[PDB]
Design an enzyme around this catalytic site. Sequence first.
Site, PDB file in Angstrom:
ATOM      1  N   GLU A 107      45.165  32.872  30.459  1.00 46.03           N
ATOM      2  CA  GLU A 107      45.947  34.025  30.898  1.00 46.03           C
ATOM      3  C   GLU A 107      47.306  34.081  30.203  1.00 46.03           C
ATOM      4  O   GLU A 107      47.792  35.165  29.868  1.00 46.03           O
ATOM      5  CB  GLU A 107      46.098  34.003  32.429  1.00 46.03           C
ATOM      6  CG  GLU A 107      46.492  35.351  33.067  1.00 46.03           C
ATOM      7  CD  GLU A 107      47.992  35.670  32.942  1.00 46.03           C
ATOM      8  OE1 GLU A 107      48.786  34.715  32.736  1.00 46.03           O
ATOM      9  OE2 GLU A 107      48.381  36.870  33.054  1.00 46.03           O
TER      10      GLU A 107
ATOM     11  N   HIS B 248      48.977  29.825  36.087  1.00 48.39           N
ATOM     12  CA  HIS B 248      49.063  31.262  35.841  1.00 48.39           C
ATOM     13  C   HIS B 248      50.030  31.462  34.666  1.00 48.39           C
ATOM     14  O   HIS B 248      49.789  30.925  33.587  1.00 48.39           O
ATOM     15  CB  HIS B 248      49.466  32.017  37.128  1.00 48.39           C
ATOM     16  CG  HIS B 248      49.167  33.491  37.112  1.00 48.39           C
ATOM     17  ND1 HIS B 248      49.296  34.288  38.234  1.00 48.39           N
ATOM     18  CD2 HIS B 248      48.734  34.310  36.119  1.00 48.39           C
ATOM     19  CE1 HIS B 248      48.959  35.532  37.931  1.00 48.39           C
ATOM     20  NE2 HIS B 248      48.613  35.574  36.656  1.00 48.39           N
TER      21      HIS B 248
ATOM     22  N   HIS C  47      49.102  28.333  41.660  1.00 49.50           N
ATOM     23  CA  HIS C  47      48.644  28.947  42.914  1.00 49.50           C
ATOM     24  C   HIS C  47      47.681  27.998  43.617  1.00 49.50           C
ATOM     25  O   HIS C  47      46.459  28.213  43.584  1.00 49.50           O
ATOM     26  CB  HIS C  47      47.952  30.297  42.712  1.00 49.50           C
ATOM     27  CG  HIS C  47      48.808  31.334  42.067  1.00 49.50           C
ATOM     28  ND1 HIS C  47      49.992  31.770  42.621  1.00 49.50           N
ATOM     29  CD2 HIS C  47      48.647  32.032  40.915  1.00 49.50           C
ATOM     30  CE1 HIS C  47      50.530  32.681  41.830  1.00 49.50           C
ATOM     31  NE2 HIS C  47      49.732  32.863  40.792  1.00 49.50           N
TER      32      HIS C  47
ATOM     33  N   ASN D 150      53.811  35.865  39.279  1.00 47.09           N
ATOM     34  CA  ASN D 150      52.880  36.169  38.203  1.00 47.09           C
ATOM     35  C   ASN D 150      53.294  35.517  36.888  1.00 47.09           C
ATOM     36  O   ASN D 150      52.520  34.742  36.308  1.00 47.09           O
ATOM     37  CB  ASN D 150      52.748  37.696  38.041  1.00 47.09           C
ATOM     38  CG  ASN D 150      51.573  38.082  37.186  1.00 47.09           C
ATOM     39  OD1 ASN D 150      51.537  37.778  35.993  1.00 47.09           O
ATOM     40  ND2 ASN D 150      50.602  38.749  37.786  1.00 47.09           N
TER      41      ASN D 150
ATOM     42  N   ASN E  95      54.633  42.090  36.314  1.00 52.01           N
ATOM     43  CA  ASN E  95      53.670  41.192  35.682  1.00 52.01           C
ATOM     44  C   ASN E  95      54.351  40.362  34.586  1.00 52.01           C
ATOM     45  O   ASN E  95      55.008  39.367  34.883  1.00 52.01           O
ATOM     46  CB  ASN E  95      52.484  42.016  35.143  1.00 52.01           C
ATOM     47  CG  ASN E  95      51.274  41.157  34.822  1.00 52.01           C
ATOM     48  OD1 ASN E  95      51.414  40.023  34.330  1.00 52.01           O
ATOM     49  ND2 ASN E  95      50.082  41.678  35.096  1.00 52.01           N
TER      50      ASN E  95
ATOM     51  N   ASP F  15      50.238  43.706  30.554  1.00 53.49           N
ATOM     52  CA  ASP F  15      50.149  42.451  31.286  1.00 53.49           C
ATOM     53  C   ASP F  15      51.295  41.557  30.843  1.00 53.49           C
ATOM     54  O   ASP F  15      52.436  41.760  31.287  1.00 53.49           O
ATOM     55  CB  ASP F  15      48.748  41.845  31.131  1.00 53.49           C
ATOM     56  CG  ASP F  15      48.431  40.806  32.217  1.00 53.49           C
ATOM     57  OD1 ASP F  15      49.269  39.935  32.457  1.00 53.49           O
ATOM     58  OD2 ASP F  15      47.351  40.844  32.839  1.00 53.49           O
ATOM     59  N   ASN F  16      51.072  40.563  29.981  1.00 55.92           N
ATOM     60  CA  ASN F  16      52.143  39.632  29.613  1.00 55.92           C
ATOM     61  C   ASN F  16      52.853  40.044  28.325  1.00 55.92           C
ATOM     62  O   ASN F  16      52.237  40.554  27.385  1.00 55.92           O
ATOM     63  CB  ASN F  16      51.621  38.199  29.426  1.00 55.92           C
ATOM     64  CG  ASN F  16      51.157  37.557  30.717  1.00 55.92           C
ATOM     65  OD1 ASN F  16      51.375  38.079  31.798  1.00 55.92           O
ATOM     66  ND2 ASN F  16      50.511  36.408  30.604  1.00 55.92           N
TER      67      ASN F  16
HETATM   68  O1  OCH Z   1      48.293  38.223  35.335  1.00 53.82           O
HETATM   69  C1  OCH Z   1      47.323  38.682  35.882  1.00 53.82           C
HETATM   70  C2  OCH Z   1      46.555  37.954  36.878  1.00 53.82           C
HETATM   71  C3  OCH Z   1      45.465  38.484  37.464  1.00 53.82           C
HETATM   72  C4  OCH Z   1      45.034  39.800  37.119  1.00 53.82           C
HETATM   73  C5  OCH Z   1      43.916  40.379  37.715  1.00 53.82           C
HETATM   74  C6  OCH Z   1      43.539  41.645  37.351  1.00 53.82           C
HETATM   75  C7  OCH Z   1      44.281  42.342  36.388  1.00 53.82           C
HETATM   76  C8  OCH Z   1      45.391  41.796  35.787  1.00 53.82           C
HETATM   77  C9  OCH Z   1      45.775  40.513  36.157  1.00 53.82           C
HETATM   78  N1  OCH Z   1      46.880  39.938  35.582  1.00 53.82           N
HETATM   79 TB    TB Z   2      50.085  38.265  33.858  1.00 50.49          TB
END
Ligand code: OCH
Ligand code: TB
Length: 338
Positions: free
Chosen positions: A36, A98, A117, A151, A207, A252-253
């Site tokens: 992730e 995570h 987590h 997150n 996020n 996301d990241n």
């Molecule tokens: O960082 C994350 C962690 C879980 C997650 C689940 C569904 C979609 C995006 C996600 N992003």
């Molecule tokens: Tb993320």
Amino acid sequence: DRQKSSFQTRFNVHREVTPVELPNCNLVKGIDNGSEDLEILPNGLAFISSGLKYPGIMSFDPDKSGKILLMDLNEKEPAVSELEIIGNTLDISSFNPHGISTFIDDDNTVYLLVVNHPGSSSTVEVFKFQEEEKSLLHLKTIRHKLLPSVNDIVAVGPEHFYATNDHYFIDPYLKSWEMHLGLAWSFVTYYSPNDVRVVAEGFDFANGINISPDGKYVYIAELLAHKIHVYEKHANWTLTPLRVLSFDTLVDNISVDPVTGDLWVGCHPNGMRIFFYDAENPPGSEVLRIQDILSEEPKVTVVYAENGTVLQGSTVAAVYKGKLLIGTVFHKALYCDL
Ligand SMILES: O=c1ccc2ccccc2[nH]1
Ligand SMILES: [Tb+3]
Ligand SMILES: O=c1ccc2ccccc2[nH]1
Ligand SMILES: [Br-]
Ligand SMILES: [Br-]
Ligand SMILES: [Tb+3]
């Protein structure tokens, strides 16, 4: 009925990815249960968190533990090795990592901070990287009322960081409701040994988070609003809004190229496919590059995208000396030439 139109924009319910190909992409051997988050040090060592179990998200090995992996991106055929966690202050059997961040001290000590987590709670674990022995020394477990559902974090010191909480509630049932309802109560926390306070709030699933190489600006990804927020970071660690970029993909990241300050972002084109898994309709991947994010018109480039037949559910991408490393929530990882 405004709550069904909104749920459907937020989750990009009928979007399909426009593929963008890169030459010479290779799946990373040994990464089959998520990657992730990742972070590349200046010297080209890369840390990868893997094995995330997330309430209500797919998992191919529900019963095998997470781990931190190491890759040396200066090698031409880089292999992943599992970093050994040493210390008696941490229960490894529950380890579920995570987001991550690193901080290099004046003495060149490398600290790795890892969102963890164990159960439905959130901690931030502090490790000291032991390069020669390929191992992580555990130093501290951090927990706070203001870190309910962490997150990602960005380290600004050995136990100093900004953290995103992607929900306000801790109970998996309530945060499922909170998400579906679009309350947008998630928030960003500054943590230090001396002071812990909320520095920004009112987010639809905050996020990714990162910092410009000069420390002046902080970047926060708001997943279900498809926004990246830019903040001025003051010397007393407060944040003041500056810009908001919009996209039509779930961001996301965030990684930051140290040389240019560009953001590299892992994105989920379709929210339904990432949040409600279906092995017959796997989620795809998408990687954005953002340049001159302070300028009046930032340059946003899709550098890689695909419908999921190679790489499912991209969350993170970073570049090192011409190569691109892409990780996912629960699937594999991809190493490409740019
Ligand atoms: O960082 C994350 C962690 C879980 C997650 C689940 C569904 C979609 C995006 C996600 N992003
Ligand atoms: Tb993320
Ligand atoms: O912005 C807001 C507005 C209302 C509210 C109520 C309970 C908890 C957090 C909240 N945040
Ligand atoms: Br709760
Ligand atoms: Br998709
Ligand atoms: Tb991170």
